[PDB]
Amino acid sequence: MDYKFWYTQPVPKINDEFNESVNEPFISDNKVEDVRKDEYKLPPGYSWYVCDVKDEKDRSEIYTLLTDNYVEDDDNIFRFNYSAEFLLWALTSPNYLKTWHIGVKYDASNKLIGFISAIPTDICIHKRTIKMAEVNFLCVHKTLRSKRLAPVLIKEITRRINLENIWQAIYTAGVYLPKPVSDARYYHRSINVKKLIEIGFSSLNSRLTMSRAIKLYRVEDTLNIKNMRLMKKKDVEGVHKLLGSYLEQFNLYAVFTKEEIAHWFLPIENVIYTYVNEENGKIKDMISFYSLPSQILGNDKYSTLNAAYSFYNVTTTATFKQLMQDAILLAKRNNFDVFNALEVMQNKSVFEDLKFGEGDGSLKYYLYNWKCASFAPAHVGIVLL
Numbered sequence: 001m002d003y004k005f006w007y008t009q010p011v012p013k014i015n016d017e018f019n020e021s022v023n024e025p026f027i028s029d030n031k032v033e034d035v036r037k038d039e040y041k042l043p044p045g046y047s048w049y050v051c052d053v054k055d056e057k058d059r060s061e062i063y064t065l066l067t068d069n070y071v072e073d074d075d076n077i078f079r080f081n082y083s084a085e086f087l088l089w090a091l092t093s094p095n096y097l098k099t100w101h102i103g104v105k106y107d108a109s110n111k112l113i114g115f116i117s118a119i120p121t122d123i124c125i126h127k128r129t130i131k132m133a134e135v136n137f138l139c140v141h142k143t144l145r146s147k148r149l150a151p152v153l154i155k156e157i158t159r160r161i162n163l164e165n166i167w168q169a170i171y172t173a174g175v176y177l178p179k180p181v182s183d184a185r186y187y188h189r190s191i192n193v194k195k196l197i198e199i200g201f202s203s204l205n206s207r208l209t210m211s212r213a214i215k216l217y218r219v220e221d222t223l224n225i226k227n228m229r230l231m232k233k234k235d236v237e238g239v240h241k242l243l244g245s246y247l248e249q250f251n252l253y254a255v256f257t258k259e260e261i262a263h264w265f266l267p268i269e270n271v272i273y274t275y276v277n278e279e280n281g282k283i284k285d286m287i288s289f290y291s292l293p294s295q296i297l298g299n300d301k302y303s304t305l306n307a308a309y310s311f312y313n314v315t316t317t318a319t320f321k322q323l324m325q326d327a328i329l330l331a332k333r334n335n336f337d338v339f340n341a342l343e344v345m346q347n348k349s350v351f352e353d354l355k356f357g358e359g360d361g362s363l364k365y366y367l368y369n370w371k372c373a374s375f376a377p378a379h380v381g382i383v384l385l
């Protein structure tokens with residue numbers, strides 16, 4: 001609650017509130033020529049390390065660090081378990097910098113004990129498009145917590161981003177920091193009810209016996225949009241047009257190039273699933289979701305919760321409810337146990353009807369070095385990884 005580090009950074013104070021007409025950096029007229037050229041100082045016996053995410057072995061090291069040390073749910077039952085291949089896709093998007101993929105090693109073990117990453121992306125906030133970094137995967141080894149490593153990681157990636165004449169960033173966290181531009185609850189749609197019950201993800205009452213819970217969450221194996229199919233390279237221009245058009249209504253969204261569309265949407269097994277409805281060689285409807293397993297900590301029977309996370313979903317030929325009903329069936333068809341979605345975009349309107357349950361927390365959206373009015377999650381049009 002003191003935010004001793006955060007309060008030194010160009011982010012709003014916890015009591016700052018800005019008019020709708022304020023939409024600008026906290027610190028303008030920055031100069032690349034003035035940016036520190038020296039790496040930030042690490043504690044004795046630790047070293048910066050530039051990770052090559054395209055090298056299987058370096059990628060494996062980041063994977064291991066995240067598997068053992070990344071985000072857990074509030075009750076420490078689950079831990080996110082991003083796959084190696086997901087990390088490769090997440091970090092090697094168009095115009096990515098290797099030098100924004102930053103490790104820290106303990107010199108004596110040669111072991112990776114900290115990470116932070118960013119990728120470039122054009123972000124439209126309140127109708128101004130700004131070159132930004134999207135920051136993700138900040139992680140410090142569980143054995144080294146509350147030693148103020150995280151601010152060094154932050155300050156070092158800020159410096160390397162600033163060297164590229166980028167002065168804004170976007171990120172998200174579960175934790176409250178100075179100061180969200182928006183705050184979105186997450187919801188879950190049970191698919192394998194029994195499993196989710198057995199692992200303590202979901203529960204039963206005397207009203208809801210096991211057979212009744214299973215029957216509740218039953219879906220028909222038949223698509224509302226019969227032609228919905230895996231996206232193909234030929235669809236890239238059609239998706240770019242459909243998605244790009246739709247995203248303009250929002251207060252915060254990424255501005256995608258065709259190269260970014262192909263990267264972010266072309267399907268990769270166990271990473272990203274995009275489906276399209278093509279009519280007359282035109283893309284009219286799209287569904288997408290990414291795969292993010294959680295490791296189930298100390299359950300005798302199951303080791304992994306497979307989960308699909310709603311990415312971007314646009315319909316022009318069905319209702320948004322029918323579209324999302326199809327997104328659920330498609331995730332069931334891909335052996336997911338649960339479908340997760342944030343109350344962003346049009347999502348919340350379908351949660352009651354599609355039998356989504358409210359989850360235990362929320363995801364806060366932040367900008368660095370940007371001053372603007374905050375807004376309700378309906379007005380958020382971007383989903384980070």
Ligand SMILES: CCCCCCCCCCCCCC(=O)CSCCNC(=O)CCNC(=O)[C@H](O)C(C)(C)COP(=O)(O)OP(=O)(O)OC[C@H]1O[C@@H](n2cnc3c(N)ncnc32)[C@H](O)[C@@H]1OP(=O)(O)O
Nearest residue numbers: 003004005006136137138139140145146148149150167168
């Ligand atoms: C223009 C370019 C700008 C680029 C940069 C943009 C900004 C990018 C910012 C990064 C966005 C990343 C987004 C992202 O990856 C998605 S959110 C996921 C973050 N990762 C985890 O939660 C994994 C599990 N936790 C850990 O590994 C550690 O607890 C971490 C490393 C989180 C904190 O390590 P620690 O050992 O627990 O703590 P200290 O070293 O003692 O440091 C304490 C200081 O860290 C502040 N803190 C804690 N969690 C934070 C978080 N999630 N964002 C930002 N700040 C966070 C905290 O408030 C405190 O500052 P304060 O005293 O002022 O309160």
Ligand SMILES: COc1cccc(CC(=N)NC(=O)c2ccc(Cl)cc2OC2CCNCC2)c1
Nearest residue numbers: 071072073078079080186294340341342384385
């Ligand atoms: C069930 O396993 C979990 C494992 C770890 C943490 C949690 C609880 C949680 N924090 N959930 C979510 O943040 C989350 C829950 C639902 C959704 Cl739709 C998105 C979420 O965040 C994602 C996007 C930001 N980067 C991480 C993925 C759940």
Ligand SMILES: [Cl-]
Nearest residue numbers: 008040152155
């Ligand atoms: Cl400093």
Ligand SMILES: [Mg+2]
Nearest residue numbers: 146147148149
């Ligand atoms: Mg620390």
